[PDB]
Design a protein around this ligand. Sequence first.
Ligand code: ZLA
Length: 156
Amino acid sequence: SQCSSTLVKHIKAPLHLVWSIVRRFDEPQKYKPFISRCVVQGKKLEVGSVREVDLKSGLPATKSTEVLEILDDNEHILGIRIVGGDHRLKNYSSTISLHSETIDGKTGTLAIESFVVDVPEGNTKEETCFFVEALIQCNLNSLADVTERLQAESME
Ligand SMILES: O=C(Cc1cc(C2CC2)c(-n2cc(CNC(=O)c3cnc4ccccc4n3)nn2)c(C2CC2)c1)NC1(C(=O)O)CCCCC1
């Protein structure tokens, strides 16, 4: 079986700033708190690019290997798929897109992030959804914190 879900985050920063962070397939650690390092060979932002991701020390896994499936700089879509690593996420893939919006009369960014993953042996579908959703929520919360802080720092 699989878990498939979508999470939404409202970010109080302009799209061009948020996208400049999200699009860096080679630097996920800039806002994903559980990631330490990341290396991409060749043209780092091309479809088919492979990133080797180092997780922070003290986790059950240590590394993930992930492929760039989509990078659309016009419509602000990033799609990735995990293809290796010493974790238990099999057939994980995700898409995040960003969209301009207006909340409280000010320009901001809507992030929509969807995933599909297999339910691993030994876990329930509910546990699998909860695990991935909590981590994506942590990442989207961190993306908002990072970009809203960059926004504040840029203002006079
Ligand atoms: O943010 C991250 C970083 C990231 C990436 C990874 C693994 C390399 C992929 C991990 N990890 C995972 C593990 C070991 N447990 C599993 O494998 C795993 C798989 N089924 C489960 C199903 C139910 C309950 C627990 C489960 N447990 N040890 N470390 C973490 C740790 C947990 C905080 C963070 N990853 C995502 C991203 O958006 O980049 C968001 C979350 C989904 C994957 C993509």
